[PDB]
């Protein structure tokens, strides 16, 4: 109990770290109390990411009600000042689910942490805007007392140059927007308003960004389905006209810029909806062809695509030239999200489907495959017996073929002779995962259970 536990927290430190750390987990869930503590102490003096997992895997799951918390903090504080790479992430992710257990400590052990966060507001700032996140994230009531400091800190502390905090920041703006909203938006205007008249250039576009998702849902409503597979509205004119401008003025001057761009411009199209729709895409028809911009192009064509629906038909055959020349040569994750956006235009995807049934079998063009069959039922039985056929290719005759299962259960189809290829697999497979996925396909795809040709086959794999 004393040299185990220990050797797996040391092996822990040096997939298998996360393993560990879930079996001590489960080990002191059935339960040696000052070990633990020496442990932790041994391995957070040391080395810290298995540390922060040891200490974060124990809340939760032990009890620890008061005595743990104050041992816990000084471990959260010492870390969070001074901090390194990612596993700082985890020592914050740490020290927020520590906030979260609902103690009574829990307001005077984080309102010591959010005032010492506007102290900080570069290894520093950053941590405190990770920090400031992960409060706002776990403890919602303690981290409204102070809002009126924060705003005014985060404001300059976003201003300096570096690129690496102003992603927490804008994370952690977006937080208290959405902590503000759930229950100050004009100040944040002109703060961004003051900033813009390159340094000021994806800041004051991240901050605009926020303003523009909080006050229209509908835009970033369509971005969180496609993931998956007042103060606004006043001043909308002149920021579009200044987005517009520092679009078409940086086209080519300073990557985060461009990509920052093409993240708004969709939120604008959306919010709003024929000059600025043709310079968004004269921009996005350049950004698609650049390296390291396709990506957010391709999903920002889609947005605008689902927005602007009668604009975006004249521009059928610009695009739909660019997806084929791309499908025919195999970065192909983006392109069935985003082929699968512009149909929500019926008749010109069956010829689309020929190269995205040949660019091969993959989850995001399957879940592509699977909303574009669900909203547009018009032609299901092409793109069914392509699949059946893509998918008896595959398991005819190496990794992704638990995939091709998942999709071999996933929707219906038009299945006697697959149930007797698969009823074989796990029996000549040695792998477990192989054998697993199978059995979970085979017997979901034996549900059309008085004529005895079928009776035999289900005899058969049952």
């Not at 560990?20 to 869930?29: D, G, I």
């Not at 005595?67 to 870390?79: E, K, P, Q, S, V």
């Not at 005077?108 to 942490?113: A, L, N, R």
């Not at 300073?254 to 761009?261: A, D, G, K, P, R």
Request: charged letters at 25%.
């Amino acid at each position: 109990s004393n040299v185990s536990v220990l050797q797996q927290f040391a092996s822990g430190l040096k997939r298998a770290k996360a393993a560990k750390e879930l079996q001590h987990y489960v080990t002191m869930e059935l339960r040696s109390t000052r070990f633990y503590d020496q442990l932790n102490h041994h391995i957070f003096e040391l080395e810290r990411k298995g540390g922060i997992l040891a200490i974060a895997s124990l809340i939760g799951v032990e009890g620890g009600n008061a005595t743990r918390i104050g041992r816990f903090a000084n471990y959260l504080r010492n870390l969070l000042p001074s901090n390194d790479p990612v596993v700082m992430e985890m020592a914050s992710k740490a020290i927020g689910r520590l906030a979260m257990a609902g103690d009574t400590f829990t307001a005077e052990y984080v309102e010591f942490e959010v005032k010492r966060a506007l102290e900080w507001l570069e290894g520093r700032r950053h941590a405190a805007v990770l920090v400031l996140r992960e409060l706002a994230i776990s403890v919602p009531t303690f981290f409204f007392q102070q809002v009126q400091p924060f705003f005014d800190n985060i404001f300059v502390a976003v201003w300096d140059p570096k690129q690496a905090i102003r992603e927490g920041a804008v994370a952690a703006l977006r937080a208290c927007l959405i902590l503000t909203t759930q229950r100050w938006y004009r100040h944040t205007f002109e703060e961004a308003e003051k900033g813009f008249d390159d340094d000021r250039i994806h800041g004051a576009l991240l901050i605009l960004n926020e303003l523009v998702r909080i006050s229209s849902m509908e835009g970033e409503r369509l971005r969180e389905e496609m993931e998956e597979i007042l103060v606004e509205s006043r001043c909308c004119r002149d920021l579009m006209e200044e987005k517009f401008d520092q679009v078409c003025q940086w086209v080519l001057k300073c990557s985060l810029i461009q990509m920052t761009i093409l993240n708004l411009l969709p939120r604008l199209a959306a919010f709003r909806p024929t000059q600025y729709l043709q310079d968004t895409m004269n921009h996005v028809l350049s950004c698609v062809k650049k390296e390291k911009e396709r990506t957010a192009a391709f999903q920002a064509l889609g947005l605008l695509s689902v927005a602007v629906r009668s604009e975006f038909k004249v521009y059928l055959p610009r695009v739909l030239d660019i997806i084929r020349a791309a499908l025919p040569p195999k970065v192909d994750a983006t392109v069935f999200t985003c082929i699968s956006m512009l149909a929500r235009i019926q008749q010109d995807i069956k010829e689309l489907l020929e190269p995205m049934l040949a660019v091969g079998l993959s989850p995001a063009l399957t879940a592509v495959l699977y909303d574009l069959s669900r909203q547009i039922p018009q032609l299901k039985k092409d793109i069914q017996d392509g699949l059946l056929k893509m998918l008896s290719l595959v398991l005819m005759h190496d990794g992704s073929i638990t995939l091709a299962l998942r999709t071999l259960g996933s929707f219906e189809f038009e299945l006697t002779q697959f149930v007797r290829h698969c009823a074989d697999h796990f029996l000549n497979s040695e792998h477990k995962e192989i054998r697993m996925e199978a059995a979970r396909t085979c017997s979901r795809l034996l549900t059309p259970s008085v004529s005895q040709t079928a009776v035999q086959v289900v005899a058969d794999v049952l």
